[PDB]
C-alpha cells in the first residue's frame, strides 16, 4: 500500500479531503492552526496514489505527501 | 489612437517590426556588399 | 604558408573552380537570347562570381588542396601573417554587438522592475524607454566595466533563491 | 447490470455450447481431453502438410506435415500440463476438470488424442 | 416555427481598447501574466469560444465572424495566386507549348546567391517550377492572357475586403440571433439549392460559353491571340453556331424538350481527350448541368415557412427499430445546440471527400495537359490525401470534445449514443482484435517474404511467381467497369477512366493514362492500408467512447477533455484524456497516409508514368513494383534509396532548395523526439539553474520562466514530428518527380 | 583431441534452441506462479 | 505585538520553501501559540500558483 | 448515530445494462454496493457508462471498485444534493460499511476521530535516507 503522511504545516483548509477520489483522508480536531482542524489518513489501504491531495494542498511546501509503496488490487485501481 | 499604439507596442508586433528592420538591414548590406567573407 | 596551405592567388584548384563556375553559368546562358531578362541576370551572376573570386584572392586568404579558402583562428598566426580579418576583428565585432544587445535588455529589465506591474511592461514593450536605452547602449563596455568595478553588476548570494541541497 | 443480446442469449447457441466436450460437466477429464485432442490434431495436420517447406516434394509432404503437427500437439500438451500445475495449487456442482489431478489427466488425454488425430489425418490422405 | 432574419443591432462597439489588453476573452487570462505559461495559454484558448462564455448566441456570432475572416484569408491567397500567374509567370508562353515548357509562377530576388533557384523552366523564363496545377486550371477555364488573371486577382482582393467587412458588420453592427443559426432546415435548403446548385449551374454556363469554344480552338491548333475573346463568343451567335451547330437554334430546344439537339456540346464521351490528355470539357459541362439540376431539386426538401417540406426532427424520430431502442431521439437537439458535434460530422465527411477528390483526380484527369505533368499529379494527390487525413483526425477530436462538454445524459436515456457508450467495451475489444489480426496478416507477409528472400528461398515468398495472393474482387470490378460501355452503359462512348482497361492515351510522348494492373504486391499494400486505417480508427474511437469515464478513471469527464493525466496512481494514468488519443491518432494517421502516398508514387512511376517509344512503353522505374514491393528491403532499396538520388545530388542546380529542405525536415522531425521522449520536470529544474545564473547578473525576467506543460510538450512534439516527416516526403517527392518526370 | 563429431551441431543446435529453452521456460513458469505456504 | 510588523518586508528562511531567500510582505501575525503565525504574501507565484504562505517567527527575518 | 446495515432487497435504478459492469472479481474477491435515497425519479449518469434513472426512494447499485462508488457519491451530492453511503461486500456475505465511516462526511471535522499518519514536523525536518538504510525493507525517511 502507498504511504500517505500529514505534516504540521497543515492549515486545515480541507481541500485535500474534498479532492480525494477514494475517501482516504479526513479531518480531525487540532490546536496548531486557526482552523482548529488537521488532515488525517486512516484509510491508506484504499489509496491509489493519484496525488490529487498534493495538487489541492496550498501550503509551501505541501502538508500531505504520497509515497508510492507496495502495489495491490486496491492500490492499482483494478476493477477485475 | 492611444489604444492602437499600445497594441502596436505589444511583444509580437514589436518583434515583427524589429525583425523586419534587422532582416532588411542585413539584406541591404549583403545587396550593396555582395559575398562578404572576411573583413 | 600556415599549415602547409597556399595563397588563393596562386592555387591552381582555386582558378580551376572559378573556371568551372563560370563555365556552368556560361553553359546555362548559351540557351537564351542576348538582350533578355535571363541573359542579363546570368551575366550579372557571372560578374558577381568574378568579383567574388578576385576579392577573395585580393584579401590574402589561404586555400587548401581543394581550392577553397581556409580561415585562421589563432590570434598569433593571424596577426603575424595578416589574417586578422578572418577570425579576430569579426570576433570583437560580434562581442560588441552581442554585449550591446545584452546590456540594453538588462537595462530595460532593471528600469521596468521598479514599476507597479513589471510583467505588463514585459509583454507590452515601452517603446520610448526601449528606444532611449537602445541609443544609450553605445557605451556598453565602459558602463559594464564601471558596474563591475563598483560591485553593482552582481547580486549577493543571500538574495538569490537556491534548492534545499 | 450486464448487457444481454440475442447472440449470447439464443437457446440454439447455448445448446451447441453445452453439447461441446468442455461444457459436459460430468464425464471423465481424460475422455474430454481425448475428444478435444482428436478434434484438434485432425485439423492441425492440414496447414503443415499443404504449406510447409516440403509441400512441393512428393511422398514426403504428408510425412513432414504430420510430424510437425505431432510436435505441435506435444508442445500443446506440455503447455496444458504446466498450466494445470500453475493454476490448481490449493483449495451446480464443482467440475472435477478444474483440479490438479483433473487437469493432469486432461492434458494426458489431450496428448493421446492429439497424436491419434494426427496419425488418423495422415492415413486419411493415403 | 417561423424562419426569419433575427438580428441584434450594435451589440459590440468597434474599438481598439481590447487590443491593448491581451487575454481579455478569458476570465483567468485577463488578470495578466505572472509566468511564461500564460503566454502559451493566451494562444491555446484564443479560438476556444465555448470556453470563454456559456452563451450559445455569443459563440455562434464569433464562429460566423471567424468564418468570414477565414474566407477573406482564402480570397487573399487566391488573389495572390492569380497575381503571381499574371506578373511573375510564363503562362502565356506555356500556352503555346504546354508539353515542353515547365509551369512556373515564382521568381526569387538576386540576393545572397539564391538566384540559382530561378531555373530554366522554358519559354525564355527563369523561375521555380510550380506543382499546384494553376496553369492547367486556367487553361481549362479559357484564360489566354495575363490581363484576365490580373483582373481576377483584383476581384479576389475586392472579395477579400467584402469578407472582412461582412465579418466586422456581423459582429459589431448586425449580429444574428441564436434562433437564426438554429434554422438547419432553411440553411440546408439554401446550401443544397442556392450554393451548390446555382454554383454548378453558373460554372456550367461559363464552361458552355467560354471554356468549350476557347479550348476547342486551342486543341484545334489556333494561336491564343487569334482565338476570339469570351465576350465576343458570348455576344454573337455566328461564332458559337460555327463551333457548335446547336447554338443556331438558341435556347429553343431547351424549352421544347429537344435536349438531344444539344449533343454537340453536352456529351457522354468518357475516356480522355487524345490531344490534351484530360477529360472532355463537353462531358464536364454536361456533368455540371446535371449536378446543378440534382442539387436544385435536393434544395426543396426541408420545411421552412410553408406546409410543404420535411422536418428533420420528425424524420429522425420516425426511424426506430427493435434492435436500437429509442433511436435518433435527441439527435436533432444535439446537432442544433452543439457546434462541436457538427464540426465532428463535417470534418469527417470533409476529409473523406478530400481523399475521394485525390483518387478521382489522378484517375480521371479533368484538366488539359495535367496527366502528363507527373509533378502536378503526384503533388495534388499527396496534398489532398494529407488534408483529408488531418480533417479526419480533427473530426475524432471534436467528437471527443462534444462527448466531454456538450453531452447530457438526461437527453440520451436509451438512444443510439447511450447504447454505444453502454457497449463501448465490446466495440473497442473487437476493434482491437481485428487490428491485431490485420497487423499480423499484413506485416507478417512482408516479414515472411524478407526472411524467405534472405534465406535463399524465393519459391516460398508471397509473390506472383511463388505463392500468390491475387485481388480477384478488384480485378473483377475492373473488368466490369471496362466492359460497362457495351452492356450497362449504352449511351457512354467510353469508360469513366482508362485504369480499368483498354488502350493507353499519350500526350507529347508521355503516357497520360494507361490501365493499372493489380497483383500480389497491390493486395499486400491494400491490406497494409486497411490495417493502418483500422488502428487510427481504434485510437480515435477509443478516445471518443472513453472520454467521459472508463474502468480506470470513473470521473474522467470531470477532468475535462484536455488534461495531462490523473497522477502516477493506479499503476500510472499517463495520457488518459481524449486529447492524448487525438495526439496518438495524429501519428497513426501520418503513418497510414505516408504508406499510402509511397504506394501511389511507386505504382505510378512503375506501371503508369513513362515515355512512349517505337512499339513499347518505357516506365520511369522500369516496372519493378510487382517484383520488389513484396518485401521491406525492396521498399527501402528500390523506392527509398534509389529514388532519393535526385534530392541528395540536387545541390548546385535549381532544385538544390529541395535538398536543403530535405535536410531541414530531417532536423525538425528529430527535434520532435526531444519533446516526445522527455518530461517537463527535468526542464523545469534546468530552467531553475538558468534562472539562478540570471539572478546572479540581475537579468531575471519578471515573468517567471516555466517549462512547457505536459500537454504543450506533447503538442509541440507531434507538431514537429508531422512537419518534419511530411516536409521530408514533400522534398523527396517534388525533387524526384521534377528531375525525372 | 577435443574435436566434436560431425553430427554434433545437428544434435546440439536443436537441443539448445528448442529442448533446453522449453524445459527452462516450463520450470521457470512453474516457479514464478508457485504460491507460498 | 509578537512577530514582525504588519505590512513590513521579510526574507524567508525556510529551505524547502519556494520563496527561500526572497522578500515578501507581511499580512498578519497570529497572537496565539500556533507553529506558523506569520502570513507572508509574495509578488511571484510558486509552481502551484499560490502567492501566500505561513511561516514561524524564526523562519522570517526583517530584510 | 449507528452503523447502517445493508438491505439486499433494495430496488435498483432503471438501467438497461452495459458491458462496463461487474467482472469475475465480484464473484471471487469482493465488490461494492452503494445505496441512497432519492426525492424523485431522475436521470443520472452511471460511472461505468450510460444513463440510468434513479427511482423515488431507496436505490442500490453494485460496482467493481470503491472509486466508482465515490464518484457516484460525488455526483449525487453535488448535483441532486443527496446523501449516499456504500459498503464493501465479500463473496462469503460479509458487509463492511465504508463511507461516511463515522456517519459524518470527512470534509467536515467530527468529534471522536483519532488522527492517523500525522508527522509532528515539516518536510524539511525529515532525515536523510542514509539514516534509514539497512532497515527491514525499502523505507522512506517520512515513515519514521
Ligand atoms: C553562427 C553561424 C554562422 C556564421 C558565423 C555565419 C557567417 C557568415 N555568413 Mg551565414 N548562414 C548561417 C550561419 C552562419 N553564417 C545559417 C544558419 C544560414 C542559413 C540561413 C546562413 C546562410 C548564409 C547565406 C546565404 C550567406 C551567408 C553569408 C555569411 C557571411 C556574411 C558576413 C556578413 O553578413 O557581412 C557583414 C555584416 C555586417 C557588417 C553587419 C554588422 C552589424 C552592424 C551594422 C555593425 C556593427 C559592427 C561593429 C558570414 C561570414 C553570406 C556570404 O556571403 O557568405 C560568405 C551569404 O551569402 N550565410
Ligand atoms: C584559445 C587558446 C589558444 C591556443 C590553443 C593557442 C595556441 C598557440 N598560440 Mg596563441 N593566443 C591566444 C590563444 C591561444 N593560442 C590568445 C587569446 C592570444 C591573445 C593574447 C594569443 C596570442 C598569441 C601570440 C602573440 C602568439 C600565439 C602563438 C601560438 C602558437 C604557439 C605558442 C603556444 O603554444 O603557446 C601559447 C600562446 C601564448 C602563451 C601567447 C604568447 C605566445 C608565446 C609566448 C609563444 C610565442 C613565441 C614564438 C613566437 C613561438 C614560435 C617560434 C617560431 C615558430 C616562430 C600556438 C599554436 C605564437 C605563434 O605561433 O605565433 C604565430 C604567437 O606568437 N598566440
Ligand atoms: C479594425 C476593425 C476592428 C476593430 C477595432 C475590432 C475590435 C474588437 N473586436 Mg473585431 N472584427 C473585425 C474588426 C474589428 N474588430 C473583423 C474584420 C472581424 C471579422 C473577422 C471581426 C470579428 C470579431 C470577433 C468574432 C470578435 C471580435 C472581437 C473584438 C474586440 C476584442 C478582440 C480584439 O480586437 O483583439 C485583437 C485580435 C486580433 C488582432 C486577432 C486578429 C486575427 C485576424 C482576424 C486574423 C489574422 C490572420 C493571419 C494574418 C494569418 C495567420 C498566419 C500567421 C503566420 C500570421 C474588439 C473591441 C471579439 C470580442 O468582442 O470579444 C468578446 C470577438 O470575439 N471581432
Ligand atoms: C443561396 C443562399 C446562401 C448561399 C449562397 C450561402 C453561402 C455560404 N454560406 Mg450561408 N446561410 C444561408 C444561405 C446561403 N449561404 C441561410 C439562409 C442561412 C441561415 C439559415 C445561412 C447560414 C450560414 C452560416 C451560419 C454559415 C454560412 C456559411 C456560408 C459560406 C460557406 C463557405 C463555403 O465553403 O462556401 C464557399 C465560399 C464562397 C462561394 C465565397 C463566395 C461568397 C459569396 C459572397 C456568396 C455568398 C452569398 C450569400 C447568400 C451572401 C449574400 C447576402 C448579401 C446580403 C451579401 C458560403 C459562402 C458559413 C460562413 O459564415 O461563411 C462566412 C457559416 O458559418 N451560412
Ligand atoms: C447560370 C448559367 C447561364 C447563364 C448566365 C447563361 C446566359 C446566356 N445564355 Mg446559356 N445555357 C446555360 C446556362 C447559362 N446561360 C446552360 C446550362 C445551357 C445548356 C442547356 C445553356 C445553353 C445556351 C444556348 C444554346 C444559348 C445560350 C445563350 C445565352 C445568352 C442569351 C440567353 C438568351 O437567349 O436569352 C435569355 C434572356 C434572359 C436571360 C433575360 C435577361 C435578363 C436581363 C439581364 C434583365 C436586366 C434588367 C435590368 C433592369 C436592365 C436595366 C439596365 C440598367 C443599367 C438600366 C446568355 C448570355 C444563347 C447564346 O449565347 O447565343 C449564342 C444561346 O443560343 N445558352
Ligand atoms: C474546421 C477545422 C477546425 C476548427 C474550427 C477547430 C477548432 C478548435 N479546435 Mg481543432 N482540430 C482540427 C480542426 C479544427 N479545429 C484538426 C484538423 C485537428 C487535428 C490536428 C484538430 C485537433 C484539435 C485538438 C487536439 C484540440 C483542438 C482544439 C480546438 C478549439 C480551440 C482552438 C485552438 O485550437 O486553439 C488555438 C489554435 C492554435 C494555437 C493553432 C496552433 C498552430 C499550429 C500548431 C501550427 C501548425 C503548423 C503550421 C501548419 C506550419 C507553419 C510553419 C511554421 C514554421 C510557422 C477550437 C474550437 C483544442 C480544444 O478543443 O481545446 C480544449 C484541442 O486541444 N483541435
Ligand atoms: C503473420 C503472417 C504470416 C503468415 C500468413 C505466414 C504463413 C506461412 N509461413 Mg511464415 N513467418 C512469418 C509470418 C507469416 N507466415 C513471420 C513474421 C516470420 C518471421 C518470424 C515467418 C517465418 C517463417 C518461416 C521460417 C517459415 C514460414 C513458413 C510459412 C508457411 C507455412 C507455415 C505453417 O505451416 O505453419 C502452420 C500454421 C498453423 C498451425 C496455424 C494455421 C492458422 C489457422 C488456419 C488459423 C485458424 C483460424 C480459424 C479460421 C478460426 C476458426 C474459428 C471457428 C470457425 C472454429 C505459411 C504459408 C514456412 C515456409 O517456408 O513456407 C513454405 C517456413 O519455414 N514462415
Ligand atoms: C559462452 C561460450 C559459448 C558460446 C557463446 C557458444 C555458442 C555456440 N555453440 Mg558452443 N561450446 C562452448 C561455449 C560456447 N558456445 C564450450 C566451452 C564448449 C566445449 C564444451 C562448446 C561446445 C559446443 C559444441 C559441441 C557445439 C557448440 C555449438 C554452438 C553454437 C550453437 C548454439 C549452442 O549453444 O549450442 C550448444 C553449446 C553447448 C552445448 C556448450 C555449452 C557448454 C557450457 C559448459 C555450458 C554453458 C552454460 C551457460 C554459460 C549458462 C547460461 C545459459 C542460460 C541458462 C542463460 C553456438 C554458436 C554447436 C555448433 O557448433 O553449432 C554449429 C555445437 O555442436 N558448442
Ligand atoms: C533456435 C532453434 C530452432 C530450430 C532448431 C528450428 C528448427 C526447425 N524449424 Mg524453426 N523457428 C525457430 C527456431 C528453431 N527452429 C524460432 C525461434 C522461430 C520463430 C521465429 C521459428 C519459426 C519456424 C517456422 C515458421 C517454421 C520453422 C520450421 C522448422 C523446421 C524446418 C523444416 C525443415 O525444412 O525440415 C523438415 C521438417 C520435418 C522433417 C518435420 C519435423 C517435425 C518436428 C520438428 C519433429 C518432431 C517434433 C519433436 C519430436 C518434438 C519437439 C518439441 C520439443 C521442444 C519438446 C526445423 C526442424 C518450419 C517447420 O516447422 O516445418 C513445417 C516452419 O514452418 N521454424
Ligand atoms: C454488417 C452488419 C450490419 C448490422 C446491422 O446493421 O443490422 C441491422 C440492425 C437493425 O437495427 P434497427 O432495426 O434497430 O435500426 C433502426 C434504427 O437504427 C434506424 O434505422 O442493426 C443492428 O443490429 C445494431 C447492432 C449492431 C450490429 C453489430 C454487428 C457488429 C459488426 C461490425 C463489423 C461488421 C463487419
Instruction: Delimit the domains of chain C by residue range.
Output: 1-165
Long-range contacts of E462-466 (CB under 8 A, 24+ apart): E462/E520, E462/E524, E462/E630, E463/E520, E463/E521, E463/E627, E463/E630, E464/E519, E464/E520, E464/E521, E464/E626, E464/E627
Of E296, E287, E65, residue with least CA distance to E191:
E296
Element (H, E) at E162: helix E146-168
**Paired strand residues for E104:** E129
CA–CA gap between residue E434 and residue E662 (Å, rounded):
37
8 Å CB contact of G21 and C164: no
Of E15, E157, E1, residue with least CA distance to E76:
E157
- End-to-end CA gap in chain D: 55
3-state class of E35 per DSSP?
strand
Contact at 8 Å (CB) between E116 and E653?
Answer: yes
Residues composing chain A: 80
Q: Is the dihedral of CA C15, C20, C23, C25 positive or negative?
A: negative
Q: Distance, CA E111 to ligand 1 centroid (Å)?
A: 13
Quick one: how far is CA A28 from the chain centroid?
13
Quick one: how far is CA D94 from the chain centroid?
22
Burial class (CB in 10 A: 0-12, 13-18, 19+), A25: buried
8 Å CB contact of H44 and E409: yes
DSSP secondary structure of E648-687:
HS-TTSTTHHHHHHHHHHHHHHHHHHHHHH--HHHHHHHH
Tell me whether G48 touches chain E (CB under 8 Å). no
What is the distance in angstroms between the Cα of C158 and the nearest Cα belonging to chain B?
A: 33
**Phi, psi (5° rounding) for residue E703?**
-75, 110
Q: Cell numbers 525536415 correspond to what residue?
A: E665
- Looking from the CA of E13 toward its CB, the CA atoms found within 13 Å total 4
DSSP secondary structure of E365-427:
--STT-SS-HHHHHHHHHHHHHHHHHHHHHHHHHHHHIIIII--GGG-SSBHHHHHHHTHHHH
Segments in C59-88 forming alpha helices (H): 75-80
Element (H, E) at G29: strand G23-29
Q: Cell numbers 515542353 correspond to what residue?
A: E100
**Paired strand residues for H34:** H61, H86
Q: Distance, CA D34 to ligand 7 centroid (Å)?
A: 26
Tell me the three cell numbers of residue E167: 465579418
**Phi, psi (5° rounding) for residue E709?**
-70, 165
Q: Cell numbers 449533343 correspond to what residue?
A: E263
Of A23, A2, A13, A20, residue with least CA distance to A63:
A13
Separation in Å, CA E303 to CA D37, D119, E5, E185, E196: 67, 74, 16, 6, 19
- Angle of helix E578-603 relative to helix E520-545, nearest 10 degrees, comes to 170
Q: Cell numbers 435527441 correspond to what residue?
A: E330
CA–CA gap between residue D118 and residue D35 (Å, rounded):
13
CA–CA gap between residue E386 and residue E355 (Å, rounded):
8
Interacting residues of C32 by C-beta distance below 8 A, sequence separation 6+:
C38, C39, C42, E124
- Looking from the CA of E549 toward its CB, the CA atoms found within 13 Å total 23
Q: Is the dihedral of CA E361, E363, E368, E373 positive or negative?
A: positive
Of E104, E639, E727, residue with least CA distance to E383:
E727
DSSP secondary structure of E262-279:
GGGTS----S--TTTSS-
* Domain D11-124 = CATH 1.20.1240.10: yes
Q: Is the dihedral of CA E247, E251, E252, E255 positive or negative?
A: positive
3-class secondary structure per residue, E613-646 = ECCEEEECCCCCHHHHCCCHHHHHHHHHHHHCHH
**Paired strand residues for H119:** A7
E runs forming strands in E80-184: 104-106, 119-120, 126-129, 174-176
Binding residue positions of E = 565, 574, 666, 674, 682-683
Separation in Å, CA H34 to CA E217, E426, H42: 83, 26, 17
Residues of E in contact with B35 (CB under 8 A): 113
Tell me whether D3 touches chain E (CB under 8 Å). yes
Residues composing chain E: 741
8 Å CB contact of E34 and G44: yes
- Looking from the CA of D13 toward its CB, the CA atoms found within 13 Å total 6
Tell me the three cell numbers of residue C32: 537564351
E runs forming strands in E35-185: 104-106, 119-120, 126-129, 174-176
CA–CA gap between residue H60 and residue E309 (Å, rounded):
48
3-class secondary structure per residue, E429-480 = HHHHHHHHHHHHHHHHHHHHHHHHHHCCCHHHCCCCCCCCCCCHHHHHHHHH
CB atoms within 10 A of CB F32: 8
Q: How does DSSP classify residue A37?
A: E
Contact at 8 Å (CB) between E740 and E650?
Answer: no
CA–CA gap between residue A34 and residue E75 (Å, rounded):
65
**Paired strand residues for G23:** G11
Tell me the three cell numbers of residue B6: 499600445
E runs forming strands in D1-126: none
8 Å CB contact of E569 and A71: no
Quick one: how far is CA H46 from the chain centroid?
15
Domain residues of chain D, as ranges?
11-124
Q: Cell numbers 512512349 correspond to what residue?
A: E612
Amino acid at each position: 500500500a502507498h504511504i500517505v503522511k500529514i505534516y504540521d504545516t497543515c492549515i486545515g483548509c480541507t481541500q485535500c479531503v474534498r479532492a480525494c477520489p477514494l475517501d482516504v483522508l479526513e479531518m480531525v480536531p487540532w490546536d496548531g492552526c486557526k482552523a482548529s482542524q488537521m488532515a488525517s489518513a486512516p484509510r491508506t489501504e484504499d489509496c491509489v496514489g493519484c496525488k490529487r491531495c498534493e495538487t489541492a494542498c496550498p501550503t509551501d511546501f505541501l502538508s500531505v505527501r504520497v509515497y508510492l509503496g507496495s502495489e495491490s488490487t486496491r492500490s492499482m485501481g483494478l476493477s477485475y | 489612437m492611444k489604444d492602437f499604439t499600445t497594441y502596436l507596442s505589444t511583444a509580437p508586433v514589436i518583434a515583427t517590426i524589429w525583425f523586419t528592420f534587422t532582416a532588411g538591414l542585413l539584406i541591404e548590406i549583403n545587396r550593396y556588399f555582395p559575398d562578404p567573407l572576411v573583413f | 604558408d600556415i599549415a602547409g596551405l597556399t595563397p588563393c592567388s596562386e592555387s591552381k584548384a582555386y582558378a580551376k573552380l572559378e573556371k568551372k563556375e563560370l563555365k556552368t553559368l556560361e553553359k546555362r546562358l548559351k540557351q537564351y537570347e542576348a538582350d533578355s531578362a535571363p541573359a542579363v541576370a546570368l551575366k550579372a551572376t557571372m560578374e558577381r562570381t568574378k568579383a567574388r573570386f578576385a576579392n577573395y584572392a585580393k584579401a590574402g586568404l589561404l586555400c587548401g588542396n581543394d581550392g577553397l579558402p581556409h580561415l585562421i583562428a589563432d590570434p598569433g598566426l593571424a596577426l603575424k601573417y595578416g589574417h586578422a580579418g578572418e577570425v579576430f576583428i569579426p570576433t570583437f565585432g560580434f562581442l560588441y554587438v552581442a554585449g550591446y544587445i545584452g546590456y540594453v535588455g538588462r537595462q530595460y529589465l532593471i528600469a521596468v522592475k521598479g514599476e507597479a506591474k513589471p510583467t505588463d511592461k514585459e509583454i507590452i514593450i515601452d517603446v520610448p524607454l526601449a528606444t532611449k536605452l537602445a541609443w544609450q547602449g553605445a557605451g556598453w563596455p565602459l558602463a559594464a566595466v564601471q558596474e563591475l568595478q563598483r560591485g553593482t553588476l552582481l547580486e549577493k548570494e543571500e538574495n538569490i533563491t537556491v534548492s534545499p541541497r | 447490470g450486464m448487457l444481454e443480446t440475442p447472440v449470447t442469449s439464443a437457446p440454439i447457441v447455448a445448446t451447441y455450447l453445452s453439447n461441446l466436450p468442455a461444457y459436459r460437466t460430468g464425464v471423465a477429464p481424460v475422455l474430454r481431453g481425448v475428444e478435444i485432442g482428436l478434434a484438434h490434431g485432425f485439423l492441425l495436420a492440414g496447414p503443415f502438410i499443404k504449406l510447409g517447406p516440403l509441400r512441393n516434394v512428393p511422398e514426403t509432404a504428408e510425412i513432414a506435415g504430420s510430424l510437425s503437427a505431432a510436435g505441435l500437439v506435444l508442445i500443446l500438451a506440455l503447455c496444458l500440463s504446466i498450466y494445470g500445475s500453475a493454476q490448481f495449487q490449493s483449495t451446480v456442482a464443482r467440475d472435477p476438470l478444474f483440479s490438479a489431478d483433473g487437469w493432469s489427466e486432461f492434458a494426458a488425454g489431450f496428448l493421446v488424442g492429439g497424436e491419434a488425430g494426427v496419425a488418423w489425418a495422415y492415413v486419411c490422405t493415403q | 416555427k417561423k424562419v426569419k432574419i433575427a438580428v441584434d443591432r450594435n451589440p459590440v462597439e468597434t474599438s481598439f481598447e481590447k487590443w491593448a489588453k491581451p487575454g481579455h476573452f478569458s476570465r483567468t487570462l485577463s488578470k495578466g501574466p505572472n509566468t511564461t505559461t500564460w503566454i502559451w495559454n493566451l494562444h491555446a484558448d484564443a479560438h476556444d469560444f465555448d470556453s470563454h462564455t456559456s452563451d450559445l448566441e455569443e459563440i455562434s456570432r464569433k464562429v460566423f465572424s471567424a468564418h468570414f475572416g477565414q474566407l477573406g484569408i482564402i480570397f487573399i491567397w487566391l488573389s495572390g495566386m492569380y497575381f503571381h500567374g499574371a506578373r511573375f509567370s510564363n503562362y502565356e508562353a506555356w500556352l503555346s507549348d504546354p508539353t515542353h515548357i515547365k509551369p512556373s509562377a515564382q521568381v526569387v530576388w538576386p540576393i545572397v546567391g539564391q538566384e540559382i533557384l530561378n531555373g530554366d523552366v522554358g519559354g525564355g523564363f527563369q523561375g521555380i517550377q510550380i506543382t499546384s496545377g494553376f496553369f492547367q486550371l486556367w487553361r481549362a477555364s479559357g484564360i489566354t492572357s495575363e490581363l484576365q488573371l490580373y483582373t481576377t486577382a483584383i476581384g479576389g482582393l475586392v472579395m477579400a475586403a467584402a469578407m472582412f467587412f461582412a465579418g466586422w458588420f456581423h459582429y459589431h453592427k448586425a449580429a444574428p440571433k441564436l434562433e437564426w443559426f438554429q434554422n438547419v432546415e432553411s440553411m440546408l435548403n439554401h446550401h443544397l439549392g442556392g450554393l451548390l446548385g446555382l454554383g454548378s449551374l453558373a460554372w456550367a454556363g461559363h464552361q458552355i460559353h467560354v471554356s468549350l469554344p476557347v479550348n476547342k480552338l486551342l486543341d484545334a491548333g489556333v494561336d491564343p491571340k487569334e482565338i476570339p475573346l469570351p465576350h465576343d463568343l458570348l455576344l454573337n451567335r455566328a461564332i458559337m453556331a460555327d463551333l457548335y451547330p446547336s447554338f443556331a437554334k438558341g435556347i429553343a430546344p431547351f424549352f421544347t424538350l429537344n435536349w438531344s439537339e444539344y449533343s454537340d456540346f453536352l456529351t457522354f464521351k468518357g475516356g480522355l481527350n487524345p490531344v490534351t490528355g484530360g477529360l472532355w470539357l463537353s462531358d464536364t459541362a454536361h456533368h455540371h448541368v446535371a449536378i446543378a439540376v440534382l442539387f436544385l431539386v435536393a434544395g426543396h426538401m426541408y420545411r421552412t415557412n410553408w406546409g410543404i417540406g420535411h422536418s428533420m426532427k420528425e424524420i429522425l424520430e420516425a426511424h426506430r427499430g427493435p434492435f436500437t431502442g429509442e433511436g435518433h431521439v435527441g439527435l436533432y437537439e444535439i446537432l442544433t445546440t452543439s457546434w462541436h458535434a457538427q464540426l465532428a460530422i463535417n470534418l469527417a465527411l470533409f476529409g473523406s471527400l478530400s481523399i475521394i477528390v485525390a483518387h478521382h483526380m489522378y484517375a480521371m484527369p479533368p484538366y488539359p495537359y495535367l496527366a502528363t505533368d507527373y509533378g502536378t499529379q503526384l503533388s495534388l494527390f499527396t496534398h489532398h490525401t494529407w488534408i483529408g487525413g488531418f480533417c479526419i483526425v480533427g473530426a475524432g477530436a471534436h467528437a471527443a470534445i462534444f462527448m466531454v462538454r456538450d453531452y447530457d445524459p438526461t437527453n440520451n436515456y436509451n438512444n443510439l449514443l447511450d447504447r454505444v457508450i453502454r457497449h463501448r467495451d465490446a466495440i473497442i475489444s473487437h476493434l482491437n482484435w481485428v487490428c491485431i489480426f490485420l497487423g499480423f496478416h499484413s506485416f507478417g507477409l512482408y516479414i515472411h517474404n524478407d526472411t524467405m528472400s534472405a534465406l535463399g528461398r524465393p519459391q516460398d515468398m508471397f509473390s506472383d511467381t511463388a505463392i500468390q495472393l491475387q485481388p480477384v474482387f478488384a480485378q473483377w470490378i475492373q473488368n466490369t467497369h471496362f466492359l460497362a460501355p457495351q452492356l450497362t452503359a449504352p449511351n457512354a462512348l467510353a469508360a469513366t477512366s482508362l485504369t480499368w482497361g483498354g488502350d493507353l492515351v499519350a500526350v507529347g510522348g508521355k503516357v497520360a493514362m494507361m490501365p493499372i494492373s493489380l497483383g500480389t504486391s497491390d493486395f499486400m499494400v491494400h491490406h497494409i492500408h486497411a490495417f493502418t486505417i483500422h488502428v487510427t480508427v481504434l485510437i480515435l474511437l477509443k478516445g471518443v467512447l472513453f472520454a467521459r469515464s472508463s474502468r480506470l478513471i470513473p470521473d474522467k469527464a470531470n477532468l475535462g477533455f484536455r488534461f495531462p493525466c490523473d497522477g502516477p496512481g493506479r499503476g500510472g494514468t499517463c495520457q488518459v484524456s481524449a486529447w492524448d488519443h487525438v495526439f496518438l491518432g495524429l501519428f497513426w494517421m501520418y503513418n497510414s497516409l505516408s504508406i499510402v502516398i509511397f504506394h501511389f508514387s511507386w505504382k505510378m512511376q512503375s506501371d503508369v508514368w513513362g515515355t512512349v517509344t517505337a512499339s513499347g512503353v518505357s516506365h520511369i522505374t522500369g516496372g519493378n513494383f510487382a517484383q520488389s514491393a513484396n518485401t521491406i528491403n525492396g521498399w527501402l532499396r528500390d523506392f527509398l534509396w534509389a529514388q532519393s538520388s535526385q534530392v541528395i545530388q540536387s545541390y548546385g542546380s535549381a532544385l538544390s532548395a529541395y535538398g536543403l529542405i530535405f535536410l531541414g525536415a530531417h532536423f525538425v522531425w528529430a527535434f520532435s523526439l526531444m519533446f516526445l521522449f522527455s518530461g517537463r520536470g527535468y526542464w523545469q529544474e534546468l530552467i531553475e539553474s538558468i534562472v539562478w545564473a540570471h539572478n546572479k547578473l540581475k537579468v531575471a525576467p519578471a515573468i517567471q520562466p516555466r517549462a512547457l506543460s505536459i500537454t504543450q510538450g506533447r503538442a509541440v512534439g507531434v507538431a514537429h514530428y508531422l512537419l518534419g516527416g511530411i516536409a521530408t516526403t514533400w522534398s523527396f517527392f517534388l525533387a524526384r518527380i521534377i528531375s525525372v518526370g | 583431441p577435443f574435436v566434436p563429431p560431425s553430427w554434433a551441431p545437428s544434435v546440439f543446435v536443436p537441443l539448445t534452441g528448442l529442448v533446453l529453452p522449453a524445459i527452462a521456460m516450463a520450470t521457470l513458469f512453474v516457479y514464478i506462479e508457485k504460491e507460498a505456504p | 505585538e509578537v512577530g514582525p510588523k504588519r505590512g513590513s518586508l521579510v526574507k524567508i528562511l525556510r529551505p524547502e520553501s519556494y520563496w527561500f531567500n526572497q522578500v515578501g510582505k507581511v499580512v498578519s501575525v497570529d497572537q496565539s501559540g500556533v507553529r506558523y503565525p506569520v502570513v507572508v504574501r509574495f509578488e511571484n507565484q510558486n509552481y502551484a500558483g499560490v502567492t501566500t504562505n505561513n511561516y514561524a517567527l524564526d523562519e522570517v527575518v526583517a530584510a | 448515530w449507528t452503523v447502517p446495515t445493508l438491505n439486499p432487497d433494495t430496488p435498483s435504478p432503471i438501467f438497461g445494462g452495459s458491458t462496463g459492469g461487474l467482472l469475475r472479481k465480484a464473484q471471487t474477491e469482493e465488490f461494492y454496493v452503494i445505496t441512497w435515497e432519492a426525492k424523485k425519479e431522475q436521470i443520472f449518469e452511471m460511472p461505468t457508462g450510460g444513463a440510468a434513472i434513479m427511482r423515488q426512494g431507496p436505490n442500490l447499485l453494485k460496482f467493481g471498485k470503491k472509486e466508482q462508488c465515490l464518484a457516484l457519491t460525488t455526483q449525487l451530492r453535488n448535483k441532486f444534493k443527496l446523501t449516499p453511503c456504500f459498503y464493501r461486500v465479500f463473496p462469503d456475505g460479509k458487509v463492511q460499511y465504508l463511507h461516511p465511516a463515522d456517519g459524518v462526511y470527512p470534509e467536515k471535522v467530527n468529534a471522536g476521530r483519532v488522527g492517523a499518519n500525522q508527522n509532528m514536523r515539516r518536510i524539511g525536518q525529515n532525515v536523510n535516507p542514509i539514516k534509514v538504510k539497512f532497515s527491514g525493507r525499502m523505507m522512506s525517511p517520512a515513515e519514521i
